[PDB]
Amino acid sequence: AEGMWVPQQLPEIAGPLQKAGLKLSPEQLANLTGDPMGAVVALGGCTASFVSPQGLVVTNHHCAYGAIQLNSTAQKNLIKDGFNAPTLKDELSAGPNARVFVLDQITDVTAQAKAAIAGAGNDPLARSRALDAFDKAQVAACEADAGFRCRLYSFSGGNTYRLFRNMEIKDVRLVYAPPGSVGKFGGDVDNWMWPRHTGDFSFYRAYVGKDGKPAAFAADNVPYQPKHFLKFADQPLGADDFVMVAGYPGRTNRYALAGEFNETASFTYPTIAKHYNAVLKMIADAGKADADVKVKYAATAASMNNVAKNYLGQLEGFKRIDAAGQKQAEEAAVLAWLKKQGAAGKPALAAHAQLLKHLDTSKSTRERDLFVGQFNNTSAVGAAITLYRLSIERSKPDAEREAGYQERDLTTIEGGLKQMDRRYVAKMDQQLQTYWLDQYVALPAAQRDNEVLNKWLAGSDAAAVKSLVNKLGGTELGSLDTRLKWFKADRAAFEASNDPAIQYAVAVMPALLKQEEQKKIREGESLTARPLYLQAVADYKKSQGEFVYPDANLSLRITFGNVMGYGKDGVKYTPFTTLEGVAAKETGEDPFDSPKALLDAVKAKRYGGLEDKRLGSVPVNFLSNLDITGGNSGSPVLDANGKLVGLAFDGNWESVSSNWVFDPVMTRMIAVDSRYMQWIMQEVAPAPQLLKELNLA
Amino acid sequence: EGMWVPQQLPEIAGPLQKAGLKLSPEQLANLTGDPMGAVVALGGCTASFVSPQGLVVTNHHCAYGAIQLNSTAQKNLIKDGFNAPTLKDELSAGPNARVFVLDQITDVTAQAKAAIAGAGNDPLARSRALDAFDKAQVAACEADAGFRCRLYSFSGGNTYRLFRNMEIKDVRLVYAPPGSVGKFGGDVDNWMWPRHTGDFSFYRAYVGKDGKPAAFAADNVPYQPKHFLKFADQPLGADDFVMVAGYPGRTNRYALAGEFNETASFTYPTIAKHYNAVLKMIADAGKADADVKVKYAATAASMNNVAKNYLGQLEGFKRIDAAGQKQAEEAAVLAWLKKQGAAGKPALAAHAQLLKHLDTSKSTRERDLFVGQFNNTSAVGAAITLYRLSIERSKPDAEREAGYQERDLTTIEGGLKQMDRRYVAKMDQQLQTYWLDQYVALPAAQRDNEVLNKWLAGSDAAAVKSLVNKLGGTELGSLDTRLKWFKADRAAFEASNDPAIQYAVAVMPALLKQEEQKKIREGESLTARPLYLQAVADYKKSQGEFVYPDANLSLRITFGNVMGYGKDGVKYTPFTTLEGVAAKETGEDPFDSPKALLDAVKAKRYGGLEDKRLGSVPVNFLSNLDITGGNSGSPVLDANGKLVGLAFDGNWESVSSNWVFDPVMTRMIAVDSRYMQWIMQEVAPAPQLLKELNLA
Numbered sequence A: 001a002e003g004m005w006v007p008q009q010l011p012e013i014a015g016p017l018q019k020a021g022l023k024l025s026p027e028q029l030a031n032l033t034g035d036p037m038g039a040v041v042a043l044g045g046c047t048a049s050f051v052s053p054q055g056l057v058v059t060n061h062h063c064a065y066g067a068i069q070l071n072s073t074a075q076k077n078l079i080k081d082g083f084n085a086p087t088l089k090d091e092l093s094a095g096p097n098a099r100v101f102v103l104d105q106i107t108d109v110t111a112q113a114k115a116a117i118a119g120a121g122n123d124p125l126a127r128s129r130a131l132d133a134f135d136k137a138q139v140a141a142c143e144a145d146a147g148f149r150c151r152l153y154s155f156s157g158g159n160t161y162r163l164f165r166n167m168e169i170k171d172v173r174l175v176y177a178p179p180g181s182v183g184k185f186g187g188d189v190d191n192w193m194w195p196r197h198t199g200d201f202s203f204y205r206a207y208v209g210k211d212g213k214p215a216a217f218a219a220d221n222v223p224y225q226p227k228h229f230l231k232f233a234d235q236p237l238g239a240d241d242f243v244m245v246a247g248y249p250g251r252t253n254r255y256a257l258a259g260e261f262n263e264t265a266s267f268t269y270p271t272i273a274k275h276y277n278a279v280l281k282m283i284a285d286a287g288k289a290d291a292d293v294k295v296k297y298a299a300t301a302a303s304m305n306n307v308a309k310n311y312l313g314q315l316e317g318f319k320r321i322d323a324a325g326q327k328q329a330e331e332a333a334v335l336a337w338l339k340k341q342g343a344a345g346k347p348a349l350a351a352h353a354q355l356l357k358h359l360d361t362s363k364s365t366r367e368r369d370l371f372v373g374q375f376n377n378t379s380a381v382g383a384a385i386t387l388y389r390l391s392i393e394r395s396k397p398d399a400e401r402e403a404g405y406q407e408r409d410l411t412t413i414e415g416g417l418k419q420m421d422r423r424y425v426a427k428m429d430q431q432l433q434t435y436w437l438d439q440y441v442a443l444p445a446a447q448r449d450n451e452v453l454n455k456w457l458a459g460s461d462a463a464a465v466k467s468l469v470n471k472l473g474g475t476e477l478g479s480l481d482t483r484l485k486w487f488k489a490d491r492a493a494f495e496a497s498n499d500p501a502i503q504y505a506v507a508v509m510p511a512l513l514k515q516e517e518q519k520k521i522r523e524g525e526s527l528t529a530r531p532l533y534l535q536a537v538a539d540y541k542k543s544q545g546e547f548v549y550p551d552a553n554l555s556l557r558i559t560f561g562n563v564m565g566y567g568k569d570g571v572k573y574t575p576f577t578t579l580e581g582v583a584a585k586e587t588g589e590d591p592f593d594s595p596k597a598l599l600d601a602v603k604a605k606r607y608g609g610l611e612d613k614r615l616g617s618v619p620v621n622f623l624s625n626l627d628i629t630g631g632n633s634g635s636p637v638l639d640a641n642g643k644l645v646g647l648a649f650d651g652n653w654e655s656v657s658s659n660w661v662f663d664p665v666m667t668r669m670i671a672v673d674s675r676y677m678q679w680i681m682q683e684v685a686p687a688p689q690l691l692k693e694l695n696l697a
Numbered sequence B: 001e002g003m004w005v006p007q008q009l010p011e012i013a014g015p016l017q018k019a020g021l022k023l024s025p026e027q028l029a030n031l032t033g034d035p036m037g038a039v040v041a042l043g044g045c046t047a048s049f050v051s052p053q054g055l056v057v058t059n060h061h062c063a064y065g066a067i068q069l070n071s072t073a074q075k076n077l078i079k080d081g082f083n084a085p086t087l088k089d090e091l092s093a094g095p096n097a098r099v100f101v102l103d104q105i106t107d108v109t110a111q112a113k114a115a116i117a118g119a120g121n122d123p124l125a126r127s128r129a130l131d132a133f134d135k136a137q138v139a140a141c142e143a144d145a146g147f148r149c150r151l152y153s154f155s156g157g158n159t160y161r162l163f164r165n166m167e168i169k170d171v172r173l174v175y176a177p178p179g180s181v182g183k184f185g186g187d188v189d190n191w192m193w194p195r196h197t198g199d200f201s202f203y204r205a206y207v208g209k210d211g212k213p214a215a216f217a218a219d220n221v222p223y224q225p226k227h228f229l230k231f232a233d234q235p236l237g238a239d240d241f242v243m244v245a246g247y248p249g250r251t252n253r254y255a256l257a258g259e260f261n262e263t264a265s266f267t268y269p270t271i272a273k274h275y276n277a278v279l280k281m282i283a284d285a286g287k288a289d290a291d292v293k294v295k296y297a298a299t300a301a302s303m304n305n306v307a308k309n310y311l312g313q314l315e316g317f318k319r320i321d322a323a324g325q326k327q328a329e330e331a332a333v334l335a336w337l338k339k340q341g342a343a344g345k346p347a348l349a350a351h352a353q354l355l356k357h358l359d360t361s362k363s364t365r366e367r368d369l370f371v372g373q374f375n376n377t378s379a380v381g382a383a384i385t386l387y388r389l390s391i392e393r394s395k396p397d398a399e400r401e402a403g404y405q406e407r408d409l410t411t412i413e414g415g416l417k418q419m420d421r422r423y424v425a426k427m428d429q430q431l432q433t434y435w436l437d438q439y440v441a442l443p444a445a446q447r448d449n450e451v452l453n454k455w456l457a458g459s460d461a462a463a464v465k466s467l468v469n470k471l472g473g474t475e476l477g478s479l480d481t482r483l484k485w486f487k488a489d490r491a492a493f494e495a496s497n498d499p500a501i502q503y504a505v506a507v508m509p510a511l512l513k514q515e516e517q518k519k520i521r522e523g524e525s526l527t528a529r530p531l532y533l534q535a536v537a538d539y540k541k542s543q544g545e546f547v548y549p550d551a552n553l554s555l556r557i558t559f560g561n562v563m564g565y566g567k568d569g570v571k572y573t574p575f576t577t578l579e580g581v582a583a584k585e586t587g588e589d590p591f592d593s594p595k596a597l598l599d600a601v602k603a604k605r606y607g608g609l610e611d612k613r614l615g616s617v618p619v620n621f622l623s624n625l626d627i628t629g630g631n632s633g634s635p636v637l638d639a640n641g642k643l644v645g646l647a648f649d650g651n652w653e654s655v656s657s658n659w660v661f662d663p664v665m666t667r668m669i670a671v672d673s674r675y676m677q678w679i680m681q682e683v684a685p686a687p688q689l690l691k692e693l694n695l696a
């Protein structure tokens, strides 16, 4: 099924669900804090779910990569080796910014929100301020009670607003990670690819204080006791079987302008992919000189690889289906339907006009902005900026601070300063600074008009760069102790410091505030215009029959469909892989270097009671026609009776383009089978204490 | 599953009927009758006669040399089509192009064995005794003017057969599709399925007006074949019986375990690394000078094919544990022999003797490769070949080194003409530089080519640069200079101040002893190799395995069925279709189909060739046949002997079968006759050929 359906749409997908094979009633799914929906949880930009009454939480390996990285060293490398905690007291802190969000409540605030936007009238900046003050106020009242964190979501370009209330668990700990050769089998070669043979899973545990409320890490913290948790399935999952996912997809752009798509396709994806592949070459090369670099920058590298490869796959996805054409046609098809309507269609035409005008701004300045943006987001310069910004925002009363820099956000900023001690190496940061500076000075002279940066460079040669990196080399912000002091410090200490990173942060901060202000004016303009056009586009879509659901916005969504393969001229991809496919791809070298205990077990056909008689072996990964995207990683896959049969982690090569234009023929989710998870834990990287917790011993 | 010699038709009679063959088995034992007499050898490819006026069909990649010889940068036939509507338009395919038509096969085993035993004990004497026997049989068989003959060793030399062939020497190019069809997917799709490649082309064979073979004259008239193939009327579908007859070159399924271990660990990875380095050099020089791109097009393509093939076999080796299967079969044979008593002692001695041959070849292997490659650069290779030939002219004809006799002169002279369209001083110098950079990088112990270090005067980069400048002053770039030395004698070469010629004069005594040494080993292996392979075949038969000699450039027969293959997560289907070619489109090489094709497919112009079981027209198909190099261009015949396509490649998991056959995943890729027809109807038309073939 196409669709990232919101739970409020359960009425209209009820029939389709049952017809696909659901054997629960949809009313049981409509209880979002009941069984099974209430066990689905957000981590941030991943999904997860509870699977035990003592607060055990399962998700993807690549979602846990962060925490695993944080706790790794070059001597004791848990990314490579995996990890297991036989008792509570062995479990490792996932870090200060690890979160588990448990849904308390959703409420519609559409009428209020719109009334606040209307109360600002004409002026764009006011329209943006008013929405911002509405958000803050709704969030303050919702978060009055301790241990809740609330968020406001814009749907359908602003036609709908809903407020989510979550309990925010702040003490999360690692319990189990398989070896990297299992969790990340096939690495960057197999990424976005079927056939796939990857054991992408890991386990956390949620803790709270003795008193029951979320607390930061503490030795006397205790396991959280969830209302609801999923059970592993006792019914073997075969081809054509019903499946569904619930989760927190991030962003889709299916209702975007043909122009937005065109700027993305011909500038952003090729540019980013190109430069990422350069930076990655540089990190790999440094990482062989010193294995501390390899480990401290491994989360950055994994994430950049994923993005760069994704972008190359979307470009090609666009040729496969000519998305420039379809966008053009559907866009002109709508502008026509509106032309027909009895004077009531004229306001949406005016909206289209405004939205067009947004796109042209950057043609000459867009390489520059990337390069400057990326330099300002290297570690020491980025810390310096964050810190200096906060000191200004601390001037103001709390209600008027920028989102990001309120009281309720201090915890998180402070956690980031801490986390960077595990992700920072001076000699590597200097190479990154050098790289993006080298790309700025290589611009045409006309496009190199960042005045602060031109002053600090005093020229456009390679020697200007070298000399500025040497000067930025005298910063103290590579010390945690220093960072934590600056975290407390007054705006005036920043303005009077000779630390070079700080000096630079102070020099750039006026332009940064001005860029930020223009952005808010654009948001302000489109806050009556996007919702108008997106309603028209949707009414037109409902005209031709067809499915209408909102673009993803980090909120909870349901997708459903069936286990099934897909086809290309000469090829039919079957819906399952098995143990033998894993062995068959053995090269004895990264990324195909499975543990020996795996190769042994497969050679001896030690299936441990998990084989599917229809396949002849234990299945590994599987395909289905569910609609997911970034953020859906780690989402639980449920069978017709709401038991866990796999985790979502990826899609196939053809699916990546469907962020923009969905293709029902060749769009597929890749999930890891609950049977492979259990197999690995029995026969390869044993977790006996954990197989007992999940009642599988 | 096997590369069966015609003499083995008895055994496979049952399997052939079982597989779906309608013809009788003994229709096929008729090698000059039907439909086998239609199958021809091109040298190192296969083809077939398909019209009573001497039309021949092969792969575009086999014809690629002819097309390239006939191409310039201004007029590139590779990129563009070629069609010849009348006889007078058909281009010469080059002096060295041939068609061999089989006359006769007689078994001469006992004479051959007699001849080597006759020399008794000395190894070098055994080498010469069989060189002498080969020549005698050849010169008597080749005595009638039209004919060419070859002696084949089978099964390590347990069998010897003589092949008699009518030698057609005027071959002309009739039709080539554009390169974006005949080589669709270039190096990305090479060795891969699913495949979408229109790999075919047409030659015409000519004789003089006597009916006798003659070199290119405009007086010559098309040969009239006794037998030719008809295109199928019956549509080919999945499960249908298919067979191929052709000339597979070499297989190594009967290699010793150490032979394999060294190919896998050294030869293939080394050659793959160095060929890729050189390919990038050539592609870069090619982008600079369009002249270089065209003249070196056959080299690049050949080097790419080899390079990707070697990468493929190494992955096969790990996918089937080749190393462990070879070891297991060797150990099992060695043990089956240890208690045959006296029936097994001879074979064990022979194994031991073969292992020494391998130990000697290890010591020198890295130098042998770089010096070999250097000595086969165009100018140096010429100098060596020409000088060697004048040395050989001194001697009477029967006493000359095979390849340097009267019969071989026409070939040698052809090579020097063909090199004209395949040589550019500045590229040859980059190739000379490359192989020399690899020699001087060797550790000092292994840089023991006396002559070459003398000519180097150092071993840094700028001593290489100085030697290549010194060789810059040669005139062997000019055709008429090469042709002059083709005529001259020993004394002139020894008198020459041409750098390359002095070089060849200097190296020739080393080369001659290195070659004397080779013949001593060849002499040792003439009794060992047959003994040991007789043991392996003995053991294999007791286990009831399929038993058949390694390919040796002779005519062979293979059979099976139209079917795909599976992998974990994937079920490959037997055919591709027109829409598959349109879907791979980029508009940039090598996925840049001609506009005519995109349009014909976009508007569903199936020219009445659609097969219903697919929504459109077939492009390529798969089947479980046993092919290897030389089987390219081989006709693929349906169960009733008609033609349904040409063999042109294998899938990725197949290439490893050179050394260890995997039946589950070894498949042939062929181009379907309907795609051929479809192309000459709706894309780059050839109505004149549709007429000649009874498809209009």
Ligand SMILES: N[C@@H](CC1CCCCC1)C(=O)N[C@@H](Cc1ccc(O)cc1)C(=O)O
Pocket (backbone or CB within 6 Å): A045, A046, A062, A184, A187, A191, A192, A198, A200, A306, A628, A629, A630, A631, A632, A633, A649, A650, A651, A652, A655, A656, A669, A670
């Ligand atoms: N491709 C994954 C990233 C990992 C794959 C396993 C090896 C290590 C890297 C990814 O980005 N997944 C997304 C989920 C997703 C699924 C399907 C589609 O079309 C798009 C995204 C995520 O992490 O949220």
Ligand SMILES: N[C@@H](CC1CCCCC1)C(=O)N[C@@H](Cc1ccc(O)cc1)C(=O)O
Pocket (backbone or CB within 6 Å): B045, B061, B182, B183, B186, B190, B191, B197, B199, B301, B305, B627, B628, B629, B630, B631, B632, B648, B649, B650, B651, B654, B655, B668
């Ligand atoms: N891969 C082909 C040559 C390609 C040249 C570029 C254009 C497309 C074809 C090849 O090497 N074919 C072999 C035959 C062969 C078939 C099957 C197996 O397993 C091995 C070899 C040939 O040229 O004879």
